[PDB]
Design an enzyme around this catalytic site. Structure first.
Site, PDB file in Angstrom:
ATOM      1  N   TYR A  86       2.717  10.814   5.936  1.00  0.00           N
ATOM      2  CA  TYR A  86       2.308   9.587   6.574  1.00  0.00           C
ATOM      3  C   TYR A  86       3.419   9.118   7.544  1.00  0.00           C
ATOM      4  CZ  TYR A  86       0.298   5.167   7.544  1.00  0.00           C
ATOM      5  OH  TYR A  86      -0.272   4.083   8.193  1.00  0.00           O
TER       6      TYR A  86
ATOM      7  N   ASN B 275       3.948   0.527   5.093  1.00  0.00           N
ATOM      8  CA  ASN B 275       3.856  -0.861   4.682  1.00  0.00           C
ATOM      9  C   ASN B 275       3.435  -0.892   3.222  1.00  0.00           C
ATOM     10  OD1 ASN B 275       0.943  -1.015   4.461  1.00  0.00           O
ATOM     11  ND2 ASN B 275       0.782  -1.468   6.633  1.00  0.00           N
TER      12      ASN B 275
ATOM     13  N   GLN C 296      18.437  -3.345  10.680  1.00  0.00           N
ATOM     14  CA  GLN C 296      17.274  -3.196   9.776  1.00  0.00           C
ATOM     15  C   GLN C 296      16.468  -4.466   9.555  1.00  0.00           C
ATOM     16  OE1 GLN C 296      16.738   0.108   9.713  1.00  0.00           O
ATOM     17  NE2 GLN C 296      18.835   0.243  10.471  1.00  0.00           N
TER      18      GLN C 296
ATOM     19  N   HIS D  26      13.120  -4.590  11.425  1.00  0.00           N
ATOM     20  CA  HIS D  26      11.993  -3.748  11.054  1.00  0.00           C
ATOM     21  C   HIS D  26      10.754  -4.561  10.753  1.00  0.00           C
ATOM     22  CE1 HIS D  26      12.908   0.534  11.011  1.00  0.00           C
ATOM     23  NE2 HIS D  26      14.076   0.296  10.443  1.00  0.00           N
TER      24      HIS D  26
ATOM     25  N   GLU E 142      18.470   0.861  -0.463  1.00  0.00           N
ATOM     26  CA  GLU E 142      17.946   2.010   0.237  1.00  0.00           C
ATOM     27  C   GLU E 142      19.031   2.651   1.054  1.00  0.00           C
ATOM     28  OE1 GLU E 142      15.297   1.129   3.405  1.00  0.00           O
ATOM     29  OE2 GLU E 142      14.678   3.243   3.601  1.00  0.00           O
ATOM     30  N   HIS E 143      19.760   1.810   1.804  1.00  0.00           N
ATOM     31  CA  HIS E 143      20.909   2.210   2.643  1.00  0.00           C
ATOM     32  C   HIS E 143      22.122   1.403   2.339  1.00  0.00           C
ATOM     33  CE1 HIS E 143      17.283   2.770   5.208  1.00  0.00           C
ATOM     34  NE2 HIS E 143      17.851   3.936   5.472  1.00  0.00           N
TER      35      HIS E 143
ATOM     36  N   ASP F 244      19.061   6.807  10.641  1.00  0.00           N
ATOM     37  CA  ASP F 244      17.667   6.487  10.949  1.00  0.00           C
ATOM     38  C   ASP F 244      17.047   7.506  11.892  1.00  0.00           C
ATOM     39  OD1 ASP F 244      17.776   4.164   9.299  1.00  0.00           O
ATOM     40  OD2 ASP F 244      17.343   2.739  10.885  1.00  0.00           O
TER      41      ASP F 244
ATOM     42  N   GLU G  59       8.970  23.858 -37.090  1.00  0.00           N
ATOM     43  CA  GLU G  59       7.930  23.032 -36.436  1.00  0.00           C
ATOM     44  C   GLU G  59       6.522  23.153 -37.035  1.00  0.00           C
ATOM     45  OE1 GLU G  59       8.062  23.497 -32.141  1.00  0.00           O
ATOM     46  OE2 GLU G  59       9.951  22.359 -32.123  1.00  0.00           O
TER      47      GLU G  59
ATOM     48  N   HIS H 152       2.885  30.569 -33.099  1.00  0.00           N
ATOM     49  CA  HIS H 152       4.106  30.767 -32.293  1.00  0.00           C
ATOM     50  C   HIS H 152       5.010  31.851 -32.907  1.00  0.00           C
ATOM     51  CE1 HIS H 152       2.991  26.945 -30.313  1.00  0.00           C
ATOM     52  NE2 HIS H 152       3.798  27.318 -29.338  1.00  0.00           N
TER      53      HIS H 152
HETATM   54  N1  LIG Z   1      11.850   3.287   3.080  1.00  0.00           N
HETATM   55  C1  LIG Z   1      11.620   4.077   4.124  1.00  0.00           C
HETATM   56  O1  LIG Z   1      11.809   5.263   4.082  1.00  0.00           O
HETATM   57  C2  LIG Z   1      11.107   3.573   5.437  1.00  0.00           C
HETATM   58  C3  LIG Z   1      11.408   4.250   6.617  1.00  0.00           C
HETATM   59  C4  LIG Z   1      10.889   3.710   7.792  1.00  0.00           C
HETATM   60  C5  LIG Z   1      10.106   2.549   7.792  1.00  0.00           C
HETATM   61  N2  LIG Z   1       9.826   1.910   6.640  1.00  0.00           N
HETATM   62  C6  LIG Z   1       9.008   0.685   6.575  1.00  0.00           C
HETATM   63  O2  LIG Z   1       7.617   1.011   6.758  1.00  0.00           O
HETATM   64  C7  LIG Z   1       6.951  -0.163   7.253  1.00  0.00           C
HETATM   65  C8  LIG Z   1       5.788   0.266   8.141  1.00  0.00           C
HETATM   66  O3  LIG Z   1       4.860  -0.801   8.345  1.00  0.00           O
HETATM   67  P1  LIG Z   1       3.859  -0.632   9.572  1.00  0.00           P
HETATM   68  O4  LIG Z   1       2.639  -1.534   9.485  1.00  0.00           O
HETATM   69  O5  LIG Z   1       4.773  -0.591  10.803  1.00  0.00           O
HETATM   70  O6  LIG Z   1       3.239   0.850   9.463  1.00  0.00           O
HETATM   71  P2  LIG Z   1       1.945   1.417   8.655  1.00  0.00           P
HETATM   72  O7  LIG Z   1       1.452   2.625   9.407  1.00  0.00           O
HETATM   73  O8  LIG Z   1       2.520   1.549   7.261  1.00  0.00           O
HETATM   74  O9  LIG Z   1       0.668   0.430   8.717  1.00  0.00           O
HETATM   75  C9  LIG Z   1      -0.343   0.532   9.718  1.00  0.00           C
HETATM   76  C10 LIG Z   1      -1.629   0.809   8.988  1.00  0.00           C
HETATM   77  O10 LIG Z   1      -1.603  -0.064   7.851  1.00  0.00           O
HETATM   78  C11 LIG Z   1      -2.824  -0.819   7.793  1.00  0.00           C
HETATM   79  N3  LIG Z   1      -2.565  -2.293   7.939  1.00  0.00           N
HETATM   80  C12 LIG Z   1      -1.674  -2.932   8.752  1.00  0.00           C
HETATM   81  N4  LIG Z   1      -1.745  -4.285   8.588  1.00  0.00           N
HETATM   82  C13 LIG Z   1      -2.689  -4.539   7.663  1.00  0.00           C
HETATM   83  C14 LIG Z   1      -3.285  -5.725   7.005  1.00  0.00           C
HETATM   84  N5  LIG Z   1      -2.919  -6.991   7.269  1.00  0.00           N
HETATM   85  N6  LIG Z   1      -4.247  -5.512   6.095  1.00  0.00           N
HETATM   86  C15 LIG Z   1      -4.690  -4.285   5.755  1.00  0.00           C
HETATM   87  N7  LIG Z   1      -4.208  -3.161   6.297  1.00  0.00           N
HETATM   88  C16 LIG Z   1      -3.223  -3.226   7.241  1.00  0.00           C
HETATM   89  C17 LIG Z   1      -3.748  -0.376   8.932  1.00  0.00           C
HETATM   90  O11 LIG Z   1      -4.960   0.234   8.483  1.00  0.00           O
HETATM   91  C18 LIG Z   1      -2.911   0.544   9.797  1.00  0.00           C
HETATM   92  O12 LIG Z   1      -3.672   1.711  10.127  1.00  0.00           O
HETATM   93  C19 LIG Z   1       8.022  -1.020   7.976  1.00  0.00           C
HETATM   94  O13 LIG Z   1       8.026  -2.425   7.635  1.00  0.00           O
HETATM   95  C20 LIG Z   1       9.370  -0.385   7.627  1.00  0.00           C
HETATM   96  O14 LIG Z   1      10.308  -1.361   7.178  1.00  0.00           O
HETATM   97  C21 LIG Z   1      10.313   2.407   5.489  1.00  0.00           C
HETATM   98  N1  LIG Z   2       4.106  25.374 -25.724  1.00  0.00           N
HETATM   99  C1  LIG Z   2       4.741  24.015 -25.524  1.00  0.00           C
HETATM  100  C2  LIG Z   2       6.218  24.015 -25.934  1.00  0.00           C
HETATM  101  C3  LIG Z   2       6.440  24.112 -27.416  1.00  0.00           C
HETATM  102  C4  LIG Z   2       7.124  23.311 -28.266  1.00  0.00           C
HETATM  103  N2  LIG Z   2       7.016  23.846 -29.517  1.00  0.00           N
HETATM  104  C5  LIG Z   2       6.287  24.946 -29.446  1.00  0.00           C
HETATM  105  N3  LIG Z   2       5.927  25.127 -28.190  1.00  0.00           N
HETATM  106  C6  LIG Z   2       4.575  23.724 -24.053  1.00  0.00           C
HETATM  107  O1  LIG Z   2       5.449  24.167 -23.299  1.00  0.00           O
HETATM  108  O2  LIG Z   2       3.603  23.068 -23.620  1.00  0.00           O
HETATM  109  N1  LIG Z   3      15.546   2.380   8.801  1.00  0.00           N
HETATM  110  C1  LIG Z   3      14.202   2.887   8.486  1.00  0.00           C
HETATM  111  C2  LIG Z   3      13.959   4.159   9.273  1.00  0.00           C
HETATM  112  C3  LIG Z   3      13.737   3.958  10.723  1.00  0.00           C
HETATM  113  C4  LIG Z   3      12.807   4.471  11.547  1.00  0.00           C
HETATM  114  N2  LIG Z   3      13.049   3.961  12.798  1.00  0.00           N
HETATM  115  C5  LIG Z   3      14.094   3.160  12.744  1.00  0.00           C
HETATM  116  N3  LIG Z   3      14.529   3.139  11.500  1.00  0.00           N
HETATM  117  C6  LIG Z   3      14.329   3.264   6.968  1.00  0.00           C
HETATM  118  O1  LIG Z   3      15.076   4.266   6.642  1.00  0.00           O
HETATM  119  O2  LIG Z   3      13.731   2.624   6.068  1.00  0.00           O
HETATM  120 ZN   LIG Z   4       4.145  26.123 -27.676  1.00  0.00          ZN
HETATM  121 ZN   LIG Z   5      15.696   1.589  10.697  1.00  0.00          ZN
END
Ligand SMILES: NC(=O)c1ccc[n+]([C@@H]2O[C@H](COP(=O)([O-])OP(=O)(O)OC[C@H]3O[C@@H](n4cnc5c(N)ncnc54)[C@H](O)[C@@H]3O)[C@@H](O)[C@H]2O)c1
Ligand SMILES: N[C@@H](Cc1c[nH]c[nH+]1)C(=O)O
Ligand SMILES: N[C@@H](Cc1c[nH]c[nH+]1)C(=O)O
Ligand SMILES: [Zn+2]
Ligand SMILES: [Zn+2]
Ligand SMILES: NC(=O)c1ccc[n+]([C@@H]2O[C@H](COP(=O)([O-])OP(=O)(O)OC[C@H]3O[C@@H](n4cnc5c(N)ncnc54)[C@H](O)[C@@H]3O)[C@@H](O)[C@H]2O)c1
Lengths: 429, 430
Positions: free
Chosen positions: A122, A207, A255, A258, A323-324, A357, A411, A416
């Site tokens: 995504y 989102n 950030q 964003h 996260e960062h 980023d 067991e 087994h």
């Molecule tokens: N943790 C991470 O790795 C990371 C990295 C980059 C970005 N992000 C975050 O991801 C977020 C992305 O948000 P975005 O909207 O820009 O992208 P998005 O693509 O996640 O959202 C767009 C889609 O979401 C739906 N949508 C949007 N608003 C809506 C609403 N009010 N109701 C219902 N559905 C809705 C729509 O169907 C649309 O197609 C950012 O806020 C950013 O902070 C996170």
């Molecule tokens: N057969 C089990 C493992 C096991 C524990 N005791 C006997 N067997 C499984 O891996 O799903």
């Molecule tokens: N800072 C965002 C990633 C990003 C995309 N574009 C800019 N920044 C995150 O890692 O959550």
């Molecule tokens: Zn087993």
């Molecule tokens: Zn960023």
């Protein structure tokens, strides 16, 4: 002005409340969209795209091999190529050589890597369109050798996919492009549709609706997994008296911009930090930003924490589990061994999160909400399964078998035991 | 007699239906399990005790013990010897997975790296319903020990009569807390914490459909917990050719059938020359003399035999089914290894019954079931770790990479991202 705390002043309860994030119920919103795409396929998908994205589309799935190589301003192309190159290198470096282990003679055990056959990636397109993310997700998928790679991206108002997103997709070997977003995209990939391939694992940031749809579908009968909850971006900056206040401010706002959902944390470590100057810089820099409105909204749930020293600062950071993490202190590299929870780390004064980023090579799809306590960012292994393999010689089974029999007895599992015993009797004859 | 199929005879629809397992659909199990989880969330140890009384028929006041408080249990020295060999083999296989943390420097002054950190607290579910499984304690606790997890809570429902072999392994692998509880009430106790039970960040381990469903539910909860995988009712798929000894094949199918009624077993016959009748005669013969033959027969009632023209076809079907365990009992088994795509753990050849892997070969038996072998790995050292990526730029490095970052930030419409670079490069300039 950003809310401020002092660590020594806080009760356990006040301290633990600082782990909480701004945004949220989402399942209630998202479930009907998922079930509807499950039951009704592309038709539902189109409708959802019309409703939220205000785009009417007939072809929601394109084979990437059918689409023409898009044309890019050559500075933009050069930049995304540097990024692809650095990300490729960092992820290719993660290939583990598959060593055999033979601790008993004739008991050979091993791990082998196999790629997940199909994956859905995504790529966000809401308040900002993120081709960086396409590289973060598709590059390791390409290295892994995933056969089907569906990349989902909600279209622009004129029905088009962002051309930088398509550039990266082609470069990283994406097979299918799903011109859709949100929970309807996630459900299309998890279940498959008439035109959209069914995937085994769904990746990527988004989102809260996207993120919640991912979380839901992992428990569904679709038989799908996910990488992590990778929601609204966070950054935690630790700064000491050597850090330049304007750079700190710039980093916090990098950030904050964003979205209004983002959360930012400044930990001031030790004496000598001009907190006023930092604050003055945040306001000054924020009001000249195109997205200053989002940034200010994000800043409203952000905070500054004062810590007596660096060990205390990093200890708090670990509790928050950002996260960062940007460590802008003297000898930042030396504190590396105290870091416990952080998705990705930026050490020193010349390492703004922005480089990570975009192009340093690390992966920006990172866990938020505190999920950095137990999840890693996306990596090569996120696209792989490690299948364990064993092979015993007769000698090996003669050595190990009796112990296995004893343990099966304990067991209460006679079958087994018999699977060993029967073979050892046959060896005896 | 075990149901039989021939692949050539089957429509796409019939073929894809062979992927289904005898396990109940998830929403049904969630309906059963949710009230138990919420009740332990809201009411703590009291709720856990009630469900232990209800299901396990045991009344207990101390559900959580500190492993350091409990005395070293005394074991039959043959038993202690067996578990030590297992510990040793498992330790060795898992310790071998430590990845050396190499720095990557593809541009000068742009250093990037990965570092491993252990998950600070983990909960390890060890089954004790229809059978008590100290093997599992080793499978989960050993890699936790290697990882260096600080809090390790091991959950185990107490017997009707804590199993002393379970406590032996826990002590040997450095388990800190013992939760004398099972099922969804145990899983919820670990995910949420209780008055006496530590709150964990990740929950591991195999169990029945209720345990498994509780795990799956709680990962989406506000508890802030992850899981390793759905590791439900055991499965095995055996591929056999004409060189395989029918009684060994039967023994292997029954080895996992006996785990419980919800288990599923699959025989793929590859090529010509296999005396399927002999294999069947052996299954019935061997099954009826088994203490747990009742469970095994019930599991056999959802099991099936598939005929495949050749080995490529056999392995192709196995990949569709995606078994928890795959035993390849064919000539040159090892040469087919590169065709294996979905299988949790693989047993090659004639002298490698799944049992060795279940107990002591060194591999991990906590493996994904239901077809989750398509995207999940069995438990490994990395299951207990997070890999934190780390980067550091010199001024030179930022001068070289920064402009590209600026360009990309412009494209994304994210000016503050750009300014954090620009601001630094201007200062380098003055
Ligand atoms: N943790 C991470 O790795 C990371 C990295 C980059 C970005 N992000 C975050 O991801 C977020 C992305 O948000 P975005 O909207 O820009 O992208 P998005 O693509 O996640 O959202 C767009 C889609 O979401 C739906 N949508 C949007 N608003 C809506 C609403 N009010 N109701 C219902 N559905 C809705 C729509 O169907 C649309 O197609 C950012 O806020 C950013 O902070 C996170
Ligand atoms: N057969 C089990 C493992 C096991 C524990 N005791 C006997 N067997 C499984 O891996 O799903
Ligand atoms: N800072 C965002 C990633 C990003 C995309 N574009 C800019 N920044 C995150 O890692 O959550
Ligand atoms: Zn087993
Ligand atoms: Zn960023
Ligand atoms: N995939 C793997 O890695 C793996 C490995 C070993 C074992 N297993 C499997 O683990 C399973 C062990 O199951 P088990 O039942 O013997 O032990 P278990 O500990 O998994 O579960 C037993 C508990 O379930 C609860 N319970 C029982 N009936 C219930 C009901 N009707 N509603 C709600 N809760 C209920 C009780 O609390 C009881 O303590 C077997 O299927 C075995 O094949 C899987």
């Amino acid at each position: 002005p950003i809310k401020t705390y002092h660590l020594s002043n806080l009760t356990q309860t006040e301290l633990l409340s600082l782990k909480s994030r701004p945004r949220i119920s989402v399942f209630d919103i998202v479930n009907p969209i998922v079930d509807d795409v499950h039951a009704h396929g592309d038709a539902a998908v189109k409708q959802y795209t019309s409703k939220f994205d205000k785009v009417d589309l007939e072809n929601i799935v394109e084979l990437v091999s059918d689409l023409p190589d898009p044309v890019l301003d050559p500075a933009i192309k050069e930049a995304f190529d540097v990024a692809y190159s650095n990300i490729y290198a960092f992820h290719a470096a993660q290939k583990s050589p598959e060593k055999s282990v033979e601790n008993m003679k004739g008991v050979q055990c091993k791990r082998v890597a196999r790629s997940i056959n199909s994956v859905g990636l995504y790529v966000p397109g809401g308040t900002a369109v993120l081709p960086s993310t396409a590289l973060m997700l598709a590059v390791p998928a390409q290295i892994a050798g995933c056969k089907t790679i569906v990349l989902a991206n909600p279209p622009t108002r004129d029905g088009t996919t962002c051309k930088e997103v398509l550039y990266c997709a082609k470069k990283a070997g994406v097979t299918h492009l799903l011109k859709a977003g949100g929970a309807q995209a996630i459900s299309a990939m998890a279940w498959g549709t008439e035109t959209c391939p069914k995937v085994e694992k769904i990746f990527g940031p988004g989102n809260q609706y996207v993120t919640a749809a991912k979380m839901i579908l992992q428990n569904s009968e679709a038989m799908v997994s996910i990488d992590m909850p990778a929601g609204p971006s966070e950054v935690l900056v630790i700064a000491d008296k050597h850090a330049i206040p304007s750079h700190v401010a710039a980093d916090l706002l990098s950030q904050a911009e964003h979205g209004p959902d983002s959360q930012v944390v400044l930990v001031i470590a030790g004496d000598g930090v001009d907190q006023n100057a930092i604050q003055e810089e945040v306001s000054k820099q924020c009001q000249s930003l195109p997205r200053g409105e989002f940034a200010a909204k994000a800043l409203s749930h952000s905070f500054i924490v004062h810590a007596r020293d660096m060990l205390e600062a990093i200890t708090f950071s670990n509790m928050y589990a950002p996260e960062h993490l940007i460590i802008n202190v003297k000898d930042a590299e030396k504190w590396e061994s105290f870091i416990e929870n952080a998705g990705s780390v930026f050490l020193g004064s010349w390492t703004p999160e922005s480089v990570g980023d975009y192009a340093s090579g690390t992966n920006h799809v990172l866990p938020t909400y505190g999920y950095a306590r137990m999840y890693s960012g996306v990596s090569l292994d996120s696209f792989l399964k490690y299948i364990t393999v064993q092979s015993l010689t007769e000698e090996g089974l003669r050595k190990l078998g009796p112990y296995v029999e004893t343990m099966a007895e304990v067991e209460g599992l006679e079958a087994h035991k018999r699977a060993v015993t029967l073979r050892l009797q046959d060896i005896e004859a």
